[PDB]
């Protein structure tokens, strides 16, 4: 088999700015284990209909995973813009693959508030498709240089998510996994 279990049921996830990638090759991709879970709040596929997945042959499988807040999940698709789609994780315009996400205030929300999960708020330019950027350059939001010192018009680029268990339907933590495909083949389901 292909190790979807290690991807989805994984106990910890990355902050969206440092999204994690796993290559998948030389195994059998069993989507029936995903279909059955009606716990997934998102499940869209691009280039292919999600019903035809156990019936297909995939070339360059990757499985990207990270955590964002709910009303940001819509930025996980081709052709979006917003803080996430521009400064954190940017899908290409011809993306072929599946985007799956599910509410997880049960595991990533802590009494009082969980600040481990971060996102980049500023960046001098937009991410390229599938670019990962973990730098902590102070952001020069002003006209005078910063010299690596925080202050007015000099901002730390990464910010924290405030995940209180008491958060709104849209301010809760979501776990996202992005299956990137291509259509020799090393991954095929039943």
């Amino acid at each position: 088999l292909c190790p979807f279990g290690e991807v989805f049921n994984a106990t910890r996830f990355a902050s969206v700015y440092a999204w994690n990638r796993k290559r998948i090759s030389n195994c059998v991709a069993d989507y029936s284990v995903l279909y059955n879970s009606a716990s997934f709040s998102t499940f869209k596929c691009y280039g292919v209909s999600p019903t035809k997945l156990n019936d297909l042959c995939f070339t360059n499988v990757y499985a990207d995973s990270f955590v964002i807040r709910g009303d940001e999940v819509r930025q996980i698709a081709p052709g979006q813009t917003g803080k996430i789609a521009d400064y954190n994780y940017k899908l290409p315009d011809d993306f072929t693959g599946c985007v799956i996400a599910w509410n997880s205030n049960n595991l990533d929300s802590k009494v009082g508030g969980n600040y481990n999960y971060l996102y980049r708020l500023f960046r001098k330019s937009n991410l390229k498709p599938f670019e990962r950027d973990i730098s902590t350059e102070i952001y020069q939001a002003g006209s005078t240089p910063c010299n690596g010192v925080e202050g007015f018009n000099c901002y730390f680029p990464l910010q924290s998510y405030g995940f209180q268990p008491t958060n709104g339907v849209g301010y809760q933590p979501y776990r996202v996994v992005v299956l990137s495909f291509e259509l020799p083949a090393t991954v095929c389901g039943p």
Partner: antibody
Amino acid sequence: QVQLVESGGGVVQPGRSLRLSCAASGFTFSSYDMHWVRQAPGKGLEWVAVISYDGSSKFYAESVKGRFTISRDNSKNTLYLQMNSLRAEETAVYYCVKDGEQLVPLFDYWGQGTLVTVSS
Amino acid sequence: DIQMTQSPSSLSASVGDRVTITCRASQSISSYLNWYQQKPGKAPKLLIYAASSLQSGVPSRFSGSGSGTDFTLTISSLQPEDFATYYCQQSYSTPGVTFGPGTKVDIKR
């Protein structure tokens, strides 16, 4: 000689449920995803739901997710679409549709549809 | 969310005309684009699939072209039983499938 025949339409009161039905013939119903697409009275077309060739996967347009359940029975060569908690703005003709052998959905054979009128 | 817009929403043509309907997508949908014909009170019937290739039983005076965000449907020589309403449909985002608003072609006089 592909043929689909919808049933179960009519007038339904807002909130209550209604269940639609499609009897299909003229092709191997075994291996062809089936969809429901609806057409508002004086308007255009909106996909509603898809069910795979065996029933393992079901997917909904995000505007009917959690209210409509789609299903099928390959021995009866019939298709079902249970509509719960219907709203007044959902009055339309409902078509069942046979998918067409592509990687993505396409709407190969339609059939004529059943009217659903939601009003108190 | 991916929105399809078609132009023009009205079209009057005579028999023997070159007819052109354009569809436009809010974003690149590659060439996962299908065209339908619907006549009043009937169901929609498939004309073109995957942007460019033709359905079986469809006359060859229909053709569709283009990819990315701009697509065309062409009736190279209009015939009298073609007066109808024509839709396009993107099937890229598949748990989010969307149609055009339609272009009606009527009889010029």
